Amino acid sequence: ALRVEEVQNVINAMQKILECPICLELIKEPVSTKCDHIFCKFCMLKLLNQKKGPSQCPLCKNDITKRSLQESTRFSQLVEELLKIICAFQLDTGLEYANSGSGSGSGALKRINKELSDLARDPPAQCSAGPVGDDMFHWQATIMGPNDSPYQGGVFFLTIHFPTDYPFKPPKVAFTTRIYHPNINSNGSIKLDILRSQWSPALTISKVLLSICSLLCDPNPDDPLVPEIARIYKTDRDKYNRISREWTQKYAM
Amino acid sequence: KSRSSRAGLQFPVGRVHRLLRKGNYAERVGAGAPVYMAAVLEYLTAEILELAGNAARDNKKTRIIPRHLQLAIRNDEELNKLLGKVTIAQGGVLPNIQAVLLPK
Amino acid sequence: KSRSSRAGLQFPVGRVHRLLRKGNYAERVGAGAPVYMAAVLEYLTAEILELAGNAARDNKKTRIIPRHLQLAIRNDEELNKLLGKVTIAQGGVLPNIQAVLLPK
Amino acid sequence: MEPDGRGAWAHSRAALDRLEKLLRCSRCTNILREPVCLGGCEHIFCSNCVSDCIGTGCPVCYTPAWIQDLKINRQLDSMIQLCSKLRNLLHDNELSD
Amino acid sequence: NIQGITKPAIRRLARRGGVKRISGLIYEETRGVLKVFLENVIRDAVTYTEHAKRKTVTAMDVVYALKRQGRTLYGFGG
Amino acid sequence: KRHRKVLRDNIQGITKPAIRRLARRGGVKRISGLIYEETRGVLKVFLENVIRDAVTYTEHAKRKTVTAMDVVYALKRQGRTLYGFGG
Amino acid sequence: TVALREIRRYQKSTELLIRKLPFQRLVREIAQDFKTDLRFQSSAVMALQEASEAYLVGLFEDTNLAAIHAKRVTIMPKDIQLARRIRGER
Amino acid sequence: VALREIRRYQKSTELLIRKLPFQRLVREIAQDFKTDLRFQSSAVMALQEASEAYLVGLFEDTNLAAIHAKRVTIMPKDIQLARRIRGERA
Amino acid sequence: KRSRKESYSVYVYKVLKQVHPDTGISSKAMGIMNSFVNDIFERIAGEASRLAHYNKRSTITSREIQTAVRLLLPGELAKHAVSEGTKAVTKYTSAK
Amino acid sequence: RSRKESYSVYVYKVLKQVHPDTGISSKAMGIMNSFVNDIFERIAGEASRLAHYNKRSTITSREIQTAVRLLLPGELAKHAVSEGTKAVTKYTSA
DNA sequence: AGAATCCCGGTGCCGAGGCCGCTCAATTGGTCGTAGACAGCTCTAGCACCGCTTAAACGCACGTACGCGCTGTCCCCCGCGTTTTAACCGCCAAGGGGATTACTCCCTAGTCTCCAGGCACGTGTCAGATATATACATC
DNA sequence: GATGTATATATCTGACACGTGCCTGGAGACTAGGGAGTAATCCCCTTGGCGGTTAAAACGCGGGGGACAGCGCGTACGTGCGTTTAAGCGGTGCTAGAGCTGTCTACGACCAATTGAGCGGCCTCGGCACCGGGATTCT
Ligand SMILES: [Zn+2]
Ligand SMILES: [Zn+2]
Ligand SMILES: [Zn+2]
Ligand SMILES: [Zn+2]
């Protein structure tokens, strides 16, 4: 262990920098944009090619277009040499250059396995999360209600099923218990703003888990899963918050 | 070899030269003038064709029709600013219904 | 005599001719071209000045000011179409208050 | 260190110099702390190099860009710090055993 | 003679424009607007034809007439 | 080089009275308080378009000063013609 | 409900919405006031018809905005006059 | 009171925006293209004149839109409509 | 050290006096009329140039100018402008 | 013959190097011919005007750069100019 | 009776109105070239016509989603007075860029010669348009 | 439950992708000349900062007109149905003028030589700006 962790961390950090919203590995096909961060040609084009109107940049508040993009050039050159360094790395330290990024090369499994591995090292900003145990695509989480909510102090349990094209397409987010909320189905299904026309790779497990509690803070009765609740929130608003609070005290989990 | 070959262009640099001269845009036309211009005309052509192509794919067609050229222009804000005064034959309109007209 | 004298025009037929060639509008300019053009420039000039002069008289002024040139235009349908896209420096606007804004 | 390792160690060192080679002019002689990039042609500038591309533009190249096309890439800032950190870490391990 | 533009014809144009409801009084006004538009374009198109000493108004004369009004057509060879 | 550039929210130089007077010239009887913010936004964009071109013309001439002629040409390029400053 | 079905159906299409023959008649009746004994290329008539419909459609798009601006759905003579004036003076 | 104000401002030929703060705005924008850029004093005047003319024309159209909606007070929504029809931002 | 711009200010004065012998025009107002003349000049020369190309001609004659006017000026304004044009040319050509 | 030439042959070549799987209908081609001539005229038009405004008689690539930046909105010009300068550079070196 | 729009008479500011003296650009006359006007012919594309076909347009009656006007309550806009800011005038100097000349020599126009890249045309495949039967997604 | 929208296939009717041979604009290579590229002068006019005067913008408060949200009434469209209507299609036959070719001549680029209509700057008043007081709107 001749300071191999330090060499490993600096080299792995290099990859961390040159890593897109979808890929959890060194970018092999980098393209530059107007704002200061590199994306993959394949990954960005797929995002831009969705019928969602003008797309916002997944790594900042600015926007993105197909135009204005250029061969990263310098960064493409960095990638090639960095790969050559990794060859040497396996002989210099003999350590891995990834946090168990050994899943399927299609990315369907490697991406979800790698994010969970990173999760263990760096959990969601305001909550706990980990695997259910049925598959690597089925995760659990425990989230407490923020102060700005009728659900304040309540804690809910999630069971989220991820697709093979995650995070390009939204996951099946669900609660195990029915919550008195416009966007929560009696079967647990959750409809977040971010899970439809606003879904993108921008959203990570931390952001998604935070978004769920954010929706509890501020519900969206437009095209609800449960109209019987959504109508009350839309029309009275305050009536909903009072009922939701009472419900939470017994059914939060 | 042609000028277009040397310039790495598909557009007829030789023709552009002739057009600029005959068109009396100026008393004289520089050697690099038609080269630069051809590159621009070709670039813009490529931009509109690429988008028209994608439109063809959306409709499961393998041939470009006037409608596809217009859908390409209308969806891209940049082209809309350039060609906002142009009507495309049989272009129809870009589909759009305002929220106030829809079911609630 | 002069060319404008023979034509009976106030505008410089000779300078109009020079501009048509200098501006490179065509390879050649016909002998009758600058005369016709000069006459039109004169006609339009006369129409604006005549109306501007009338505006000055209404305001009890002797010298024409930019506002009078503009009012003459704004009060003339033929000139509004001709110079509709033109802004006259320090012209102000044609006075106008809608009935719906007035007391009842 | 072993025959395969020592070769690799020398490689990684040489690789760092090659990575830095990416930022060059008659004055951009080393990796820059605050490199400025120009959209449309790259040509990364020294700390007092961007001032010339603002005044006139790139030598020979002369890209007709606006002053809004000039900015420091945050990604380089981070990568550059790491390449310096790695240079020293590799050298110390090579020296120690 | 302008009645050649039928009520349904106007409705169809309005539908393409995204109109949900049409007042029955618009049809008379719409025809008026159309009449004016055509008069302006034709006047110019005829002028071009007369200039060329032709008795036929060609597609190119319509196109030029329209370019001058800020409405360029594509696909007619102009 | 050596320019003491000043970066400020100078759009605020166009105040309520200024906008109010312009609106009055346009025949507006009452102005919502939200107009002031909207108007400034519109003005800034308009000026950006005209200035961008005026500068572009200046750059072409290899000059460092924007002349009255360049503003006038810029406006014509934008489809608006101004009399009294050009020739 | 029908209007929405028709709006979608027409926006998806490209054909000219004015019957060709009666349109041509309108053109000829106007043309005679500029010069007699004029003939038209068949393509010229199409070019003119296309320009005409495009004009009216664009006008209706703007008119529709004016109507919803006034918090109504139905297009009134008043709405077309407003849209026409703002556009007409540009 | 406002009606008298309208008459006076329509009648006068004076610039309605104070000259100094306007010039500052022009420079504030212009510096974003090139640094150390100079202007002829007449160039700024020309720009200001065009600028005021532009806004007045826009306000005249805005006013009409508000009237159409059976309102007297103009809203941001009315400016946006006028621009949308003119096609400034469409 | 010579002006390369010139103006029509001397001709505007002459025309002005013929219409309003007892009036004058300010220098700012003169700037407006000077620009006006060059604006119209460009429009007419512009259309005439286009007609030359559109009709496969290399020469601009009084015919093109006449047509350009009919296109550029509205309604009856054109009617008079054409009349003044043809009159000036006829007199000039016949030299009477 | 006297019939006006078009760019249909070049439009094909451009499409094949961009989106090779598809073809072009004859009417679509007609639209593209107008597009090329429209843009051609606009650029050439501005290049001419600039030559007059700057008291010059020869149009060079420099005047065109200016004309293009004036006509093409947004970021479109940035890409268009880039292609322009590259073509000139290669042409010059050849 | 109060407060804002003009007029009347008076001085003084500085703008423009006429004239001096000079010289670029207007005008004249002559030579030669060719772009346009005209005559003369082919046969393309347009005009007017007929009759049958069937999707489009005319006219009617039902009833209801929308337009219109009225009432009542909220707030946020306009007018007023007072304080504070910095817009504007007039002055001073330095010094950076504009417009100007005067020489250089490199780039484009015009000249001929000779060639293969695009034009018109025709052949043969096949891509899209219509219509049928298949099951779901809306309304 | 009852209509209407995308799905996958058979059929086949023009329009597109390709290939053949012709020749008309492209490229090659050379001279002459004039356009704009560089260097160097020096004269505006742009920038910046100084103070003082005082007009315009900014703050806070009164309270009232306009925005707009809800209610109820009336009818002007929208929906479907059934009855004609002439718009669209194909085919026929006539002929007016669009475009091609060839001949010849008013007339337009170009040059060199004479000279005067407008340029640019200076001397002389006279039309407007604005003070200070009055009467007429006009609320
Ligand atoms: Zn990626
Ligand atoms: Zn970003
Ligand atoms: Zn450098
Ligand atoms: Zn560069």
Do residue B87 and residue E71 have CB atoms under 8 angstroms apart? yes
Structural domain harbouring D71: 1-97
CA of B42 to C1' of K43 (A): 40
Helix, strand or coil, per DSSP, at residue D63? coil
Cβ contacts of H86 on chain F, cutoff 8 Å:
none
Nearest chain J alpha carbon to B54: J19
What SS3 string covers chain C?
CCHHHHHCCCCCHHHHHHHHHHCCCCCEECCCHHHHHHHHHHHHHHHHHHHHHHHHHHCCCCEECHHHHHHHHHCCHHHHHHHCCEEECCCCCCCCCCHHHCCC
Distance CA C23, CA J53 (A): 11
Nearest to J39 by CA among B75, B42, B64: B42
Q: Is the CB of E17 under 7 A from strand L?
A: no
CA separation (Å) from I66 to A11, C97, D44?
A: 78, 41, 59
Q: Answer yes or no: are the C-beta atoms of F54 and H19 closer than 8 Å.
A: no
Residue I68 within a domain: yes
Please name the member of D19, D42, D97 whose beta carbon is closest to the beta carbon of A2. D97
Q: Give how far Cα H13 sits from Cα of C75, C88, H47, H49, Å.
A: 17, 11, 16, 11
Across the interface, of E9, E18, E49, the residue whose CB is closest to G18 is E9
CATH fold group of domain A4-93:
Herpes Virus-1 (3.30.40)
Residue D20 and residue C63: Cα distance in Å, rounded? Answer: 74
Among C70, C60, F21, C65, smallest CA distance to H7 is for F21
Which nucleotide C1' is nearest F13 CA? L57
Our measurement of CA I34 to C1' L127, in angstroms, reads 23
Residue numbers of F between 56 and 85 with CB closer than 8 Å to I: 81, 83-85
Cα of F4 to nearest chain C Cα, Å: 33
A102: left (phi > 0), else alpha (psi -120 to 50), else beta? Answer: alpha
Give the integer Cα–Cα distance in Å for H24 and H47.
12
Do residues C68 and I29 lie in contact, with contact meaning Cβ atoms separated by under 8 Å? yes
**Pseudo-torsion of CA J17, J20, J23, J28, nearest 10°?**
-40
User: Tokens in use for G51?
Assistant: 């320009």
Nearest to F63 by CA among H39, B30, J63, D57: H39
C-alpha A129/C-alpha A140 separation (Å) is 6
Q: In what helix (H) or strand (E) does residue I34 lie, and over which residues does it extend?
A: helix I27-54
Q: How many other CB atoms sit within 10 Å of the CB of residue A19? A: 17
Question: How far apart are the C-alpha atoms of H61 and H64, rounded to whole Å?
Answer: 5
Q: How far is J89 from chain A (nearest CA, A)?
A: 19
Q: What span, in angstroms and rounded, lies between the C-alpha atoms of A173 and A189?
A: 6
CATH assignment of the domain containing I81 = 1.10.20.10
Contact H34, F66 (CB under 8 A): no
Instruction: Give the DSSP per-residue string, E7-26.
Output: HHHHHHHHHHTT-SEE-TTH
Per-window interface: G 6-65 vs B, CB < 8 A? 7-8, 11-15, 50-51, 54, 57, 61, 64
Q: Give the ligand whose atoms come closest to the C-alpha of residue A111.
A: 1
d(CA B55, CA H79): 34
The dotted CATH code for A108-252 is 3.10.110.10
Looking at strand L, which nucleotides approach a protein CB closer than 7 A?
5, 15-17, 25-28, 35-37, 45-48, 56-58, 66-68, 76-80, 86-88, 96-101, 107-109, 117-120, 127-129, 139
Please answer whether residues A252 and A155 qualify as being in contact, where contact means their C-beta atoms are separated by less than 8 angstroms.
yes
Q: Is A63 helix (H, G, I), strand (E, B) or coil?
A: strand
Alpha carbon distance D37, D43 (integer Å): 6
> What number of CA atoms fall less than 13 Å from residue H77's CA on the CB side?
13
Q: Are H44 and H22 in contact (CB under 8 A)?
A: yes
- What's the total number of domains in chain E? 1
| Domain segments of chain A as ranges | 4-93, 108-252
For A227, residues 6+ apart whose C-beta sits below 8 A from its C-beta are: none
**How much is the CA Rg of chain C, to the nearest whole Å?**
19
Residues of I in contact with C23 (CB under 8 A): 45
DSSP conformation class of J5: P
Method: cryo-EM
- Angle between helix C13-22 and C33-58 (nearest 10): 120
Contacts of C22 in chain J (CB under 8 A): none
In a 3-state reduction of DSSP, which class is residue A156?
strand
With CA atoms as reference, report the closest residue to A43 among A69, A23, A59: A23
Examine residue A167 and say whether the peptide bond preceding it is cis (omega within 30 degrees of 0): yes
Distance between the alpha carbon (CA) of C26 and the C1' atom of K39, Å: 28
Overall residue count recorded for chain D in this entry: 97
- Strand pairing of A70-71 and A30-32? antiparallel
- Cβ-contact C2, C11 below 8 angstroms: no
If one counts the domains in chain J, the total is 1
Two structure tokens written together for D59: 């030598």
Minimum-distance nucleotide, CA of I93 to C1' = L107
Protein CB footprint (7 Å) on chain K nucleotides: 4-7, 15-17, 24-28, 35-37, 45-47, 56-58, 66-68, 76-80, 86-88, 96-101, 107-109, 117-120, 127-128, 139
- Paired tokens of F21: 């007077």
Q: Is B78 on the interface with A (CB under 8 A)?
A: yes
Measured N-to-C along each axis, helices F68-77 and H41-68 cross at an angle, to the nearest 10 degrees, of 30
Q: Scanning the structure block, which residue is given the tokens 């393409």?
A: E16
Which of I35, I38, I42 would you mutate first to test chain F, the one with the most F CBs within 10 A? I35
For H82, counting Cβ atoms within 10 Å of its Cβ (0-12 exposed, 13-18 middle, 19+ buried), the class is buried
How many angstroms does the Cα of residue D68 sit away from the middle of ligand 4? 15
Place of tokens 């597609």: E59
J2 burial via Cβ count (<10 Å: 0-12, 13-18, 19+): exposed
Sheet strand arrangement including A155-161 = A128-131, A138-144, A155-161
Reduced 3-state DSSP string for H36-55:
CCEECHHHHHHHHHHHHHHH
Residue I3 is assigned to a structural domain of this protein: no
Which nucleotide's C1' is closest to F31 (Cα)? K77
Tokens of A17: 């920098």
Distance (angstroms) between ligand 4 centre and the Cα of G84 equals 49
Nucleotide nearest to C62 (CA to C1'): L127
- For residue J46, give the nearest of A160, J54, H54 by alpha carbon: J54
Token pair in block for residue G3: 């209007």
Q: Test H68 with G71 for CB contact under 8 angstroms.
A: no
Tokens 């034509």 identify what position? Answer: C7
Distance CA D81, CA I33 (A): 66
CB J72 within 8 A of CB B47: no
CA proximity to B50, closest of A41, J83, J15, J27: J15
Residues D35 and D5 sit within 8 Å (Cβ to Cβ): no
Distance between the alpha carbon (CA) of C1 and the C1' atom of L113, Å: 18
For the CA of A11 and the C1' of K45, the distance in angstroms is: 77
Touch test H–A: 3 Cβ pairs or more under 8 Å: no
Domain hosting E19: range is 1-78
Tokens 């050559």 label which residue? A84
* Chain H residues touching G89 at Cβ < 8 A: 61
Q: Cβ–Cβ contacts within 10 Å for residue A121, how many?
A: 7
- What are the C-alpha distances in Å from A127 to residues A175, A195, A207, D58? 15, 20, 11, 51
Ion ligand 4 — residues with CB < 5 Å: D 41, 43, 58, 61, 63
In terms of C-beta density within 10 A (0-12 exposed, 13-18 middle, 19 or more buried), how is residue G72 classed? Answer: middle
CA distances from J5 to B29, B64, I27, J9, J21 (A): 21, 21, 52, 10, 26
Token pair in block for residue A69: 């993009």
Any domain includes I2: no
Cβ-based contacts (< 7 Å) between C 2-31 and strand L: 2, 4, 12, 21, 27-31
| B42 in Cβ contact with J7 (< 8 Å) | no
